[PDB]
């Protein structure tokens, strides 16, 4: 059952709306099935709340793979294999990397 | 001055409110570690 | 791609199907250690393995200080200070309270603390002089005077 649980701190939106909607259903809609998800989601994302709004940092071992994403490709959560990335999306990822100070894979998973 | 008097003077009689700990934390760690108060220096640094 | 996808029976190419998806690392447990705590945990792995395999016990100061040779200069100087304050010729007693209460070891902590503070001011006087050489008039003679 391994390895895949390694990228799961790079996507800068999806996991945060996944928390917010399930906090909404567990609190404001009082939904009981959501309490048995909330405990596990809060135990998972406690680091994220302990460092509010903090980016995942830049890394040469992401930077290589983003610059090579047109030839070596990049593996993405939910997708089976490597996606080849166009030069456009590669250059957009380096722009978002230096515009927000986010890690190069987090700029790709955000794009 | 004994080392024991100076250790107390920094830790108890001036303390974290003199060394502005929330702005210069390494300076209060340095003050405790160079006075060999290693256990107090760790029990300070581990709060942050 | 169409030539390989017509190839397994009669083209001869070494692909018993396409790859198993990205499958290199052993199970990461989803991991909540950050980059710095993972670099430290790796140095503790490199410490414990040597004890488990019956090797000479390594200096844990240098294994920890080489995690501060990365990002934060104030953590690098903090480890340099911790090294100078652990450079002590400790008598091999069975009791840390006796060694920490010794007159000799308490003289040694102050002798090292003074040496650290003196080389700190020696670094500060060097940087102050080399940043201002035209005022400093240092000339060709090496020495603290």
3-state percent helix, strand, coil for chain B, nearest multiple of 5: 55, 0, 45
In the stretch 55-84 of chain C, residues with CB closer than 8 A to chain B read 74, 77-78, 81-82
Q: Do C78 and C120 contact (CB within 8 A), yes or no? A: no
- The C-alpha atoms of residue A106 and residue A70 are separated, in whole angstroms, by 17
- The C-alpha atoms of residue B8 and residue A56 are separated, in whole angstroms, by 42
- The C-alpha atoms of residue C61 and residue C136 are separated, in whole angstroms, by 37
Contact B30 C82 (CB under 8 A): no
- The C-alpha atoms of residue A59 and residue C41 are separated, in whole angstroms, by 19
Chain A closest-CA separation from residue C83 CA (Å) = 29
Look at the block and give the residue holding tokens 């070494």: C14
Q: Which of C33, C3, C32, C25 is nearest to A75 (CA)?
A: C25
Residues 6+ apart with CB under 8 A from C81: B30, B33, B34, C116
Please list the residues that pair with A74 across neighbouring strands.
Answer: A83
CA dist A24 → A18, A61, C8, C25, C53 (Å): 10, 37, 53, 36, 52
Tokens of A12: 């800068």
Q: Is the minimum CB–CB distance between C1 and chain A shorter than 8 Å?
A: no
Q: Do A59 and A104 contact (CB within 8 A), yes or no? A: yes
- The C-alpha atoms of residue C79 and residue C61 are separated, in whole angstroms, by 8
Q: Is A97 exposed, middle or buried (0-12, 13-18, 19+ CB in 10 A)?
A: buried
- The C-alpha atoms of residue C107 and residue C74 are separated, in whole angstroms, by 27
Q: Do A106 and A56 contact (CB within 8 A), yes or no? A: yes
Residues 6+ apart with CB under 8 A from B2: none
Burial C81-97 (b: 16+ CB within 10 A, else e): bbbbbeeeeeeeeeeee
Q: Do A5 and C31 contact (CB within 8 A), yes or no? A: yes
Q: Which of A83, A82, A87, A90 is nearest to A108 (CA)?
A: A90
Q: Strand, helix or coil at A61?
A: helix
Q: Hey, what's the torsion of the CAs at B12, B15, B16, B17, to 10 degrees? A: 120
Question: What method did the depositors use to determine the structure?
Answer: cryo-EM
Chains A and C touching, counted as 3 or more CB pairs less than 8 Å apart = yes
Contact C116 B34 (CB under 8 A): yes
Burial A99-111 (b: 16+ CB within 10 A, else e): eeebbbbbbbbbe
- The C-alpha atoms of residue A23 and residue A97 are separated, in whole angstroms, by 30
Tokens of A65: 């793979």
Q: Do A97 and A58 contact (CB within 8 A), yes or no? A: yes
Q: Do B11 and B37 contact (CB within 8 A), yes or no? A: yes
How many residues does this entry show for chain B?
48
- Neighbouring C-beta atoms of residue C113, cutoff 10 Å: 19
Q: Is C34 exposed, middle or buried (0-12, 13-18, 19+ CB in 10 A)?
A: middle
Tokens of C85: 């304050």
**Mutation target among C105, C113, C116 for the B interface, most CBs of B within 10 A:** C113
Look at the block and give the residue holding tokens 């340095």: B30
DSSP string for residues in chain C: -TTGGG-TTTT--S-SSS--SS--S---TT----HHHHHHHHHHHHHHHHHHTTPPPP-HHHHHHTTSSSS-HHHHHHHHHHHHTT-------S-HHHHHH-HHHHHHHHHHHHHHHHHHHHHHHHHHHHTTHHHH--TT--S--
Q: Do C39 and C69 contact (CB within 8 A), yes or no? A: no
Q: Do C120 and B34 contact (CB within 8 A), yes or no? A: no
Please list the residues that pair with A83 across neighbouring strands.
Answer: A74
Q: What backbone torsions phi and psi does residue A83 show, to the nearest 5 degrees?
A: -85, 135
Q: Which of C25, C92, C24 is nearest to C57 (CA)?
A: C92
């Amino acid at each position: 059952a391994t390895p895949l649980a390694v990228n799961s701190a790079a996507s800068l939106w999806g996991p945060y709306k996944d928390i917010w909607h399930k906090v909404g259903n567990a609190l404001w809609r009082r939904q009981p099935e959501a309490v048995h998800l909330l405990d596990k989601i809060l135990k998972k994302h406690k680091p994220d709340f302990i460092s509010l709004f903090k980016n995942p940092p830049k890394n040469v071992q992401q930077h290589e793979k983003v610059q090579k994403a047109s030839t070596e490709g990049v593996a993405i959560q939910g997708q089976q294999g490597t996606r080849l990335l166009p030069e456009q999306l590669i250059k957009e990822a380096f722009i978002l990397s230096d515009l927000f100070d986010i890690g190069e894979l987090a700029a790709v998973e955000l794009l | 001055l004994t080392l024991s008097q100076f250790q107390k003077q920094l830790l108890e009689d001036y303390g974290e409110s003199h060394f502005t700990v929330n702005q210069q934390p390494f300076l209060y760690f340095q003050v405790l570690f160079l006075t060999a108060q290693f256990e107090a220096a760790v029990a300070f640094l581990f709060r942050m | 791609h169409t030539l390989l996808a017509s190839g397994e029976d009669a083209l001869d190419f070494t692909q018993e199907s396409e790859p198993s998806y990205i499958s290199d690392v052993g199970p990461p447990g989803r991991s909540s250690l950050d980059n710095i705590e993972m670099a430290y945990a790796r140095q503790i792995y490199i410490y414990n393995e040597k004890i488990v395999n019956g090797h000479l016990q390594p200096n844990l100061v240098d294994l920890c200080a080489s995690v501060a040779e990365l990002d934060d200069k104030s953590i690098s100087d903090m480890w340099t200070m911790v090294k100078q304050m652990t450079d002590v010729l400790l008598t091999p007693a069975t009791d840390a309270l006796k060694n920490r209460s010794s007159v000799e070891v308490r003289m040694e902590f102050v002798r090292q603390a003074l040496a650290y503070l003196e080389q700190s001011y020696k670094n500060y006087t060097l940087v102050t002089v080399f940043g201002n050489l035209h005022q400093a008039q240092l000339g060709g003679v090496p020495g603290t005077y």
